[PDB]
């Protein structure tokens, strides 16, 4: 069966007033912070990082300070907009290159590094919008070549943040079929009919976990207490976490997000149940 992992991933970047990346990390409430989002990328040199007017000139030192304290940091790409696509293999390698030379281990004169010498610990795929022509499989396999242990590099935690619905959209399914996704956060907190905490998530959870046995699965919850998909901490301890911990490839809990977590200290109670 295999249960508690003590792992809590929290998203960050969706509102400046949620406080810095270093403040998140020093809360001692999260084992991984996923910055959010690289909301533009495609068949051109156009890339954009949206951190919602967040203090950019803090995050680089905070990444390193996070890593020292045992909290790795990844960057999620995509989001809820339609300003991104990856419609070719060449589009995917350009994405890798940009990611790599901007935020990871690469260094090229013609490519700036917003976070200085800080070197990120992973990439997340938040792919609300896409088509079957997308080549996130190409991105994923290249990223996986840089998930390094015992050599000149560091671990890269490759993940996908997906809608509750199984089976996933083609562009997500195509990437996941590479087999080398470390973790998948299933989001159970959206207003999606037939697939959220109020109705459908246990069934979605059953199929997801079975389809990718080599991948860890995080149950994705909202920390906004005013959402109808919010689950009281009591019911997490008693219902959500036990159910999800039935499956062998349970990895932990994902929380959307740091802004709403500061509003209700959801993780305080939740971290003991993860």
């Amino acid at each position: 069966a295999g249960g508690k992992t003590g792992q809590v991933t929290v998203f960050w970047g969706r509102n400046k007033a949620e406080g810095s990346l270093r403040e998140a990390c020093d809360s001692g409430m999260y084992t991984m912070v996923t910055m959010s989002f690289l909301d533009v990328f495609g068949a051109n040199g156009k890339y954009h990082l949206d951190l919602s007017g967040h203090d950019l000139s803090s995050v680089g030192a905070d990444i390193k300070h996070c890593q020292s304290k045992g909290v790795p940091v990844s960057l999620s790409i995509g989001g809820y907009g339609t300003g991104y696509s990856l419609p070719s293999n060449r589009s995917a390698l350009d994405l890798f290159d940009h990611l790599w030379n901007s935020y990871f281990g690469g260094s090229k004169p013609s490519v700036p590094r917003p976070f200085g010498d800080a070197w990120l610990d992973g990439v997340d795929l938040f792919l609300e919008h896409g088509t079957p022509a997308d080549r996130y499989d190409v991105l994923a396999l290249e990223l996986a070549k840089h998930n390094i242990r015992g050599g000149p590099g560091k671990p890269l935690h490759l993940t996908a943040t997906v809608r509750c619905g199984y089976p996933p959209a083609a562009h997500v399914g195509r990437a996941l079929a590479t087999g080398i996704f470390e973790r998948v956060h299933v989001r159970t907190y959206e207003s999606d009919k037939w697939c959220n905490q109020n109705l459908g998530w246990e069934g979605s959870w059953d199929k997801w976990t079975a389809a990718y046995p080599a991948t860890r699965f995080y149950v994705g919850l909202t920390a906004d207490d005013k959402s109808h998909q919010w689950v009281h901490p009591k019911n997490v301890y008693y219902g959500v976490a036990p159910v999800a911990q039935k499956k062998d490839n349970y990895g932990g809990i994902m929380l959307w997000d740091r802004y709403f977590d500061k509003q209700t200290n959801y993780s305080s109670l939740i971290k003991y149940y993860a």
Partner: protein
Amino acid sequence: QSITTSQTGTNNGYYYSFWTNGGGEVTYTNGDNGEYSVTWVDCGDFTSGKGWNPANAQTVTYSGEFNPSGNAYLAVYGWTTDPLVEYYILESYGTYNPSSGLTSLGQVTSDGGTYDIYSTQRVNQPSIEGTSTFNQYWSVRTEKRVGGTVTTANHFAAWKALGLEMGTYNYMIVSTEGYESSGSSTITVS
């Protein structure tokens, strides 16, 4: 001059690998003629040491001090490729046997003193080649020692005698490895 993030190279005709996942403060330093030194404080995971890169089954002559305060390993450590393998010939360890809850297996005699054999699958884990699924073998010692001889030809041939394939050698060092601990270690290979 000391380093603090992952890197490889050559130092006085020895291959050196130092890897860390970034956790804590791990400081690596190369000395002369096969020595290296690591001091660490609340690390996450790191490996470190000297050896040979395109490495034969070398007859390893090591010596020094290995003083973990917590969990750490001091093994003749290496990888193969095709198939991918990670092997440990564990000489000593800190506060935790790395074979904690593995189906007990053994054993093999070598260089005076005996060892123990284990095997276990790593699935979608980081490695020298990236995200992979491979076995990690062990040669644990039921008595700890820090210094002596480990003729790697005997450990390799004993695993292959039973049901565990190897592959082409890529690197083999005497690894000091910390896991969520502090400590210090100064090992010298020859």
